[PDB]
Amino acid sequence: HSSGLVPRGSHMQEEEFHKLANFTINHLLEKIEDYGDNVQIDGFDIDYGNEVLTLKLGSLGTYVLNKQTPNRQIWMSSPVSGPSRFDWDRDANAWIYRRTEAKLHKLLEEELENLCGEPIQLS
Amino acid sequence: MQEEEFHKLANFTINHLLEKIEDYGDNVQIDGFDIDYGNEVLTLKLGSLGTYVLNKQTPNRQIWMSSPVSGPSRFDWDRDANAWIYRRTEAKLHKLLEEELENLCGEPIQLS
Numbered sequence: 001h002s003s004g005l006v007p008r009g010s011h012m013q014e015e016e017f018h019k020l021a022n023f024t025i026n027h028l029l030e031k032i033e034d035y036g037d038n039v040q041i042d043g044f045d046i047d048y049g050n051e052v053l054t055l056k057l058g059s060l061g062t063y064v065l066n067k068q069t070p071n072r073q074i075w076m077s078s079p080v081s082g083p084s085r086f087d088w089d090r091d092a093n094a095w096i097y098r099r100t101e102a103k104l105h106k107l108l109e110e111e112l113e114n115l116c117g118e119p120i121q122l123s
Numbered sequence: 124m125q126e127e128e129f130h131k132l133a134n135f136t137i138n139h140l141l142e143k144i145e146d147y148g149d150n151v152q153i154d155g156f157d158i159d160y161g162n163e164v165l166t167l168k169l170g171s172l173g174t175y176v177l178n179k180q181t182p183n184r185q186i187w188m189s190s191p192v193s194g195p196s197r198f199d200w201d202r203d204a205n206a207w208i209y210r211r212t213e214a215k216l217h218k219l220l221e222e223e224l225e226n227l228c229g230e231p232i233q234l235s
Contacts, residue, residue, distance in 0.1 A: 001211075004194040005173060050159045050166045052176060061182045064164060068191065070173050077187055079180060083195040 001083070005070050012072045012088060020088055021067050021074060024095065025053055028065070028108075031122055039118050060115055074104065080111045124184045124200065132200055133179045133186055136207065137165050140177070140220070143234055151230050172227055186216065192223045 029048055032055060036044045043058025055063040061079025068075050074086045074095055086095035086104045095104035105122040113119050141160050144167060148156040155170025167175035173191025180187045186198040186207055198207035198216045207216035217234040225231050 001195055002193065004190055004192050045162060047162045049161050050157065050168065051174065052164060052166050054162045054164050054178075056162065059181065061180060062163070062178055064176055064178055064187075064189070066166075066174060066176055066189075068173060070171070070191065075176075075189060077176070077178070077189060077195070079182060083189070 005068075008071070014069065017067075017069065017072050017088075024074070024104075025065065025067075028105075028122065029053060031120070032112075035112070035116075035118075035120050039116050041116060057115065076104075078111065080115065081107075126181065126184075129181065129184045129200075130179075136186065136216070137177060137179070140217070140234060141165060143232070144224075147224065147228075147230075147232050151228050153228055169227060188216070190223065192227070193219075 025048070029046065032046050036046060041058050041060070043056055045054075045056040047054050051067055053063075053065040057063070057079070063079065064077040066075055067073075068085075071085070072087070076084050076086070078084070084097045084099075084102075084107075086097050089096045092103070096102070097104070097107070109120055109122050137160070141158065144158050148158060153169060155168065157168045159166050163179055165175075165177040169175070169191070175191065176189040178187055179185075180197075183197070184199070188196050188198070190196070196209045196214070196219075197211075198209055201208045204215070208214070209216070209219075221232055221234050
């Protein structure tokens with residue numbers, strides 16, 4: 001909660017990072033948009049622009065996701081768990097927060113069900 | 124803090140910041156400068172240097188910021204100082220952004 005851009009030697013080439021990150025973020029936008037149609041959250045609003053993904057859950061809070069290209073990471077701010085950073089794991093084929101080993105899609109699945117009462121499948 | 128009062132101040136603080144960083148981008152030369160606001164989120168892309176994100180967290184009555192230099196922070200409104208404060212470090216929101224942009228872009232800025 002004090003450092004930002006930290007150098008690393010296992011540097012995924014910028015081209016490969018954009019493919020994986022663009023595909024993952026696009027998948028999330030489509031599936032969470034369907035989620036808003038099947039549940040009724042007062043103030044629901046998901047949108048993408050200037051490389052940031054924004055999910056407003058009304059009075060429940062706001063999710064923010066964005067690419068941090070210098071670090072080769074996806075960054076997320078959550079109303080439930082705060083900040084986290086995700087790296088691509090070539091052996092698991094998923095985005096992982098190494099401080100806790102939580103997978104990105106499974107974490108959003110777990111938190112959204114607790115907040116809105118209905119399940120979602122982002123895997 | 125009343126939810127109504129939180130929305131007033133936070134909209135004022137974020138909007139004030141947006142206009143001043145737009146003027147700053149015109150008077151300095153940053154390759155890839157791009158600032159924008161939409162759906163209550165403020166985004167500052169400094170090209171290859173990274174991306175700032177600021178947004179209101181209404182349940183907590185806080186402004187949240189993600190920085191490529193210092194990472195995450197949370198700000199509360201202090202009625203005696205008239206500023207947003209990160210209580211873990213006592214940093215003011217506008218003074219913190221002033222220091223990092225000057226270090227990054229070489230020119231000073233006035234966000235107060």
